[PDB]
Amino acid sequence: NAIRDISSIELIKEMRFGWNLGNTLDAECTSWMDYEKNPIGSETCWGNVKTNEDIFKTLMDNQFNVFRIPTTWTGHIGEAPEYKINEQWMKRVHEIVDYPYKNGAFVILNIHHETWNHAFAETVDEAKVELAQVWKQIAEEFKGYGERLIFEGQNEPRKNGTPVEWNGGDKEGWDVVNAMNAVFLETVRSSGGNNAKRHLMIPPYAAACNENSFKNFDFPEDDDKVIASVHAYSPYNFALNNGEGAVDKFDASGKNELDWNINLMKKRFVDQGIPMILGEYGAMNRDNEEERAAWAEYYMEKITALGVPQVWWDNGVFEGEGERFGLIDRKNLKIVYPSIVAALQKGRGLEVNVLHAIETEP
């Protein structure tokens, strides 16, 4: 029940690097799964195994101490306007949050792939109501948790389906996102318990590392416990491109693009005293572990000099046509790419010591 009363800038210093529990509690399968009969079945409906504590303990052995829990509440929410969250779902989310928390790590709980938080001015009034009701129950469920539990108001709020979805945003989307962020901050701060001193993360438009999203991002000026949430899979062709133009080498043009976006984070947040966390990043598997290792160490070295931690996005996908950001085999508790983890440790300034590494095939 104890909570330290320290600023986000001071609390961020205790962070090394992070890991995402992707394609798990954020998996959304309402188009074919009966959420009434399977109230917690969505956790594994995208191919990941049921979450256990040993997954996080395997990662903490490799010096991970930040764990982001992407959670989708669509399908687990009752009818409007009360928006009652399913009790069995809230309990399972509580159990998974306890896995890294009860072992002493930082935890980030967010609202992820929602159908109702689209950044369209047509439905903001009801979207703000649902956002407030949902975060009221979440803040209530985790009242007595300390400063190591961090709430992230939104994931990538955007105008889905528009050409404006992934280009940075327009004036309409920027105002809706700012209004939604304000509702989230007020709802948590107004609740009781430790929530008045809990650290809160808010994203710009779509959490994009873009000038248009950075320029039109309202940030509170009198709350030292609010953090900016940015996602940056940079450079795009090497890290995120899953189609045409995808490259497997980390070339000089890729370094220039990455250096440009890291400088955008410095000018927007670091120089202006805005605490910021790279909540999502990573490089897709292209049979290029040593290319991704050098990229990861360079990326980690740069933002470590800025005091910004990063959180790897791990969806548990290794092969196939999907986005292959897998890093740990959750069923066998093994690090599939040990040199990538070693690069994170070396770039962060830690002693290189990779445990539970996968064997060598040759």
Residue numbers in the entry: -1 to 360
What does the paper say about this structure?
To facilitate bacterial protein expression and to study the contribution of fungal dockerins to enzyme catalytic activity, we characterized a single GH5 catalytic domain in isolation (ORX48147.1 residues 748–1105), as well as a GH5 with the native C-terminal double dockerin (ORX48147.1 residues 748–1192) and a GH5 with native C-terminal double dockerin and a non-native N-terminal dockerin domain. We present the crystal structure of a CelD GH5 catalytic domain in its apo wild-type form and complementary structure of an inactive E154A mutant in complex with cellotriose solved at a resolution of 2.5 Å and 1.8 Å, respectively (for convenience, in this work, we used 1–362 numbering for the catalytic domain which corresponds to 91–452 residue numbering of the “1–536” in Supplemental Table S1). The crystals of the apo form and the complex belonged to orthorhombic P212121 space group and contained two domain molecules per asymmetric unit. Almost all amino acid residues of the CelD catalytic domain, with the exception of a few side chains and three C-terminal residues, were traceable in the final electron density map. Structural features that differentiated the P. finnis catalytic domain from other GH5 enzymes were longer loops around the substrate binding site (between βI/α1, βIV/α4, α5/βVI, and βVIII/α8) and possessing only one disulfide bridge instead of four present in GH5’s from other fungi. The overall root mean square deviation (RMSD) between apo wild form and inactive E154A-ligand complex protein models was 0.26 Å for 359/362 Cα pairs, demonstrating high overall similarity and illustrating that substrate binding results in little to no conformational change. We did not observe substantial conformational changes between the apo-enzyme structure and the mutant structure with the bound ligand.
